[PDB]
Amino acid sequence: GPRSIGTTKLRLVEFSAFLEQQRDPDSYNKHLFVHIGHANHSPLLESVDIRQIYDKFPEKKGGLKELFGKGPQNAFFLVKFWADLNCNIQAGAFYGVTSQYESSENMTVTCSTKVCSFGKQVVEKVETEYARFENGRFVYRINRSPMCEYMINFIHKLKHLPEKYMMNSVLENFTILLVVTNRDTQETLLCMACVFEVSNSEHGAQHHIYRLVKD
């Protein structure tokens, strides 16, 4: 389906959370838990009433209601990810996150990743990205960013469960809020309220995009 998520001002074009393992000195394995390379869409985006997801993200000061309210509203998305947890976790391992945003405008952006448990923040990663002019447009690349220990521990404890339904029950209360801001104007460029489920057998990691609307 669609390649990227975002507006004309800012688009997320690439994203993957992965594990790199050195099997031996001449061998390397890479496994993707989640990525945006396979949109399960056949497009005009379907919408979700934002009031149905407030409980799942931090509220009060700095919260999703406050952010959505300040706008712009066309920059707010709900992204459903199916996580691929089929990998043998073996020392010589790297858990990383790669993301790439693009713009027509030359900006300095702030990328905030809030990991949430039961709607409450457990981790916040703030990364500042400066525009790189590449073949006609500005690119903001966060290459191989180290995964936070919380998330490394979470992936291990989730894999330990003997059934996908048990992992889905855990992932029901696990969310990620991604916010990209113009560091100089303070304008919200892109907001993604991420929800998670485990992928169904042989299909692999997938995602589905919805527009967040108030009414």
Structure-block tokens of residue 100 = 């790439």
Q: How far is CA 27 from CA 24, 31, 87, 90, in A?
A: 5, 14, 16, 13
One of 12, 85, 191, 212 touching ligand JJU (CB under 6 A): 85
One of 38, 125, 137, 164 touching ligand JJU (CB under 6 A): 125
Under rule CB under 6 A, how many of the chain's residues touch ligand JJU? Answer: 19
x/- binding map, residues 97-116, to ligand JJU, per CB under 6 A?
x---------------x---
> Within 40-79, which residues bind ligand JJU (CB under 6 A)?
none
Residue closer to ligand JJU by CB (options 124, 134) is 124
**DSSP-assigned letters across all residues of 114-156:** EEEETTEEEEEEEEEEE-EEETTEEEEEEEEEEPPHHHHHHHH
One of 53, 148, 161, 213 touching ligand JJU (CB under 6 A): 148
For residue 99, how many C-alpha atoms fall within 13 Å in the half-sphere facing its CB? 22
Gap between the terminal Cα atoms of the chain: 26
Residue range at the interface with ligand JJU (CB under 6 A); choices 37-45, 55-63, 67-75, 80-88: 80-88
Nearest CA to 68 out of 54, 56, 79 is that of 54
Binding of residue 155 to ligand JJU (CB under 6 A): yes
Binding of residue 158 to ligand JJU (CB under 6 A): yes
One of 50, 107, 151, 191 touching ligand JJU (CB under 6 A): 151
Whether 180 contacts 111, CB under 8 Å: yes
One of 12, 19, 34, 109 touching ligand JJU (CB under 6 A): 34
Q: CA 61: distance to chain centroid? A: 22
Residue closer to ligand JJU by CB (options 106, 173) is 173
Q: Is the peptide bond before 72 cis (omega within 30 degrees of 0)?
A: yes
Which residues in this chain contact ligand JJU in the complex, by CB under 6 A?
17, 33-34, 81, 83, 85, 97, 113, 125, 145, 147-148, 151, 154-155, 158, 176, 194, 196
